[PDB]
Amino acid sequence: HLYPGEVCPGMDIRNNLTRLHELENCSVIEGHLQILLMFKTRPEDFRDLSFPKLIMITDYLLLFRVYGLESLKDLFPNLTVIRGSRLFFNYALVIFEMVHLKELGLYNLMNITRGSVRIEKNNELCYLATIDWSRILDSVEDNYIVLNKDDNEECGDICPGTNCPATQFVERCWTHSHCQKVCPTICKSHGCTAEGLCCHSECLGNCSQPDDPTKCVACRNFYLDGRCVETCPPPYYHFQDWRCVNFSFCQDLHHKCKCHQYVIHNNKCIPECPSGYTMNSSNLLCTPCLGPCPKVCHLLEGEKTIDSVTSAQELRGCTVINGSLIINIRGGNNLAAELEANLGLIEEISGYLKIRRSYALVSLSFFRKLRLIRGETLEIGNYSFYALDNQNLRQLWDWSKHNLTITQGKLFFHYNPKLCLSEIHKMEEVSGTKGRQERNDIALKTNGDQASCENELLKFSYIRTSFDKILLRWEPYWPPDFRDLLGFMLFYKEAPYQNVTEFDGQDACGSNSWTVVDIDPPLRQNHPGWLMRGLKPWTQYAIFVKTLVTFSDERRTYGAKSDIIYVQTDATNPSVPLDPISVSNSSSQIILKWKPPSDPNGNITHYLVFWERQAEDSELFELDYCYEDSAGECCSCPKTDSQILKELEESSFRKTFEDYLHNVVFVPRPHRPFEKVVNKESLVISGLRHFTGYRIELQACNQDTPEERCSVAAYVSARTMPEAKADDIVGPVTHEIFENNVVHLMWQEPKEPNGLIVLYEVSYRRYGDEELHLCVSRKHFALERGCRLRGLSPGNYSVRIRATSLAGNGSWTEPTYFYVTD
């Protein structure tokens, strides 16, 4: 019977039992089934209630602290399949820590379409070990078997049987009155009749009639036209891997929700397109789109008050976020990179904007992609933007790489002491909010005032750059009074890309990548400037200056901002070729491996490599055995503005003293084989003497054409592979048998000394007796043209001889036999 009753979806039951009566008529508990929040429900409340139609649980059956119920015989005694369409922690059934749940009540459900079961810390669940967990799932995954009241045997399990069909646990049962209908262990996720009878794949859970799709109690693959269809016609979309839903159905869901208005992917109706895909408004299809792509992404609670990394991490997987925003960012030292990683790709917001309590910011360049506020959620007074509490808001976005034309809402700039109104002017002009004649509440009493956005700029009239030291002397700056100028503040940092500045830096407190330099102002005649004390050669740096002038309570400012120059340090001698690794891959081939200079100082044109024969030593032939402190600038030394305030106070004190005095004073009328390695870090030195050391020079040359600006020598001694093949004693041992049986041993030196031969081993042996070995020193070897067989014995002698080279011993020669007669 294909779900003869009502198809009712999932629900989270709390403090109620009425919906259980609906389950009687229900055949499919669509979705999940959660029983929780039983803080006032007792076991007597739940009694044995049967559902003569219930066949499905499309999702997992969650039980949580159900103080009600006395057993599972009370609720759900009739059930056919726990669909594995959706899971919970990869468990298609979670029964977690509930008191007052002792027995069970089912015998027909022997399958879960897919997933697992989380039997964790059961408090009274009996008849658990009586049922095996391998007859219900396709495969075991994350399955807990421990923490049961029967594996632990914490329940008195009575088994009426293993009808009660034939197959620690006494038998296969579910209650003192319910046995298990164990079927062949092939209907794991496809289920079997409640008589221990397995059937085909189409039928799921139970099968009164084993085969055919129109006789299945529950369907496995898909449902359409009253039968368990294996595949859904494209008009009927594959829905939740269990049925076939018409296109009208999916369009109706799409319109009802707009709730994730339903779409279709691969002719499968789904609430929203899968990640890595995007909207296709033809059949609401899902066309691939990698990365966070523009989609209907409604921010949680219609906004996202971002003050932490996680709050800003919710933008991923979405590009056009729906909902307003409250910018509550505070703190963070050089951390906005992660932000722009999460927000730089965002370019559209449905609601308004709020900037409440944002202080760890300086400039606004974080959004070069955003160009329009939808303003669906419109603030009071028709506002799509709200900036406030920005104690440090120096500058806003440019109008070259960032565009903006606001369609609705106004602009709000309050409590922004570091915000000068020129930026606000640019915002309103390009956006057009003021152009829309909208009264943008801009607190001029907080914006512009207590902020100095001056027009004066400086330029380096004199420049002198070296590989480490850069000398500068810019134009002198002179405000209306010579006393107005209060020194200059230089700012320099590296320039990998000539597009960065301090406003492109951390734009917050803490250690910024940019470095600050201060210069004594000239006298009103010298050119203000600075000579760098040292820099890494062959490196570019962005440098600019912003001077200091006198400031009073009236906000009197004359600040001059020298322009940013991206200048690269000059090159110098390249550093050493790192890691010379010379190994011999053959008796004539040596492989040298190394790394380029630490400081290239221009492209490494080539490398200089040599080698010197480190042959065998002469004495081996004779060997016969027969303080540091921080210097200059500091990167971990901050400067407090209180010093600036005290300096200004002191300077004002002195100037007031001076003026006091002046007005009081006056009243008006009363060599070696070598190779050059070009752009390589490994090379085999073929053709070298065998068993020969090679002190290999290694230099790195970043210049080859004008000069050989080469690094210093890196000497490594690599010895070629020794050859011991030639230590075998050559020639039979001719026996110069003298009168006294003195055999002047005629055995010749092997073909090669293999480096050098230290001695000779002669294993001459009295035939048919204990063997003997004789060491023949090279001096003695030459003296006796071999050796002398003295003190011999009558009879034959077995004489094997093996040389002793330094590259390895050879082989024992043939045993030469001479018979000493009687």
Binding site: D481, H662, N663, V665, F666, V667, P668, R669
Partner: peptide, 21 residues
């Protein structure tokens, strides 16, 4: 009283000589 003019504005030569005679 000299500063209240020479930095407020450009003091006239007569103003400067006022303090010298």
């Amino acid at each position: 009283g000299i500063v209240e003019q020479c930095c407020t504005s450009i003091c006239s030569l007569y103003q400067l000589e006022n303090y010298c005679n």
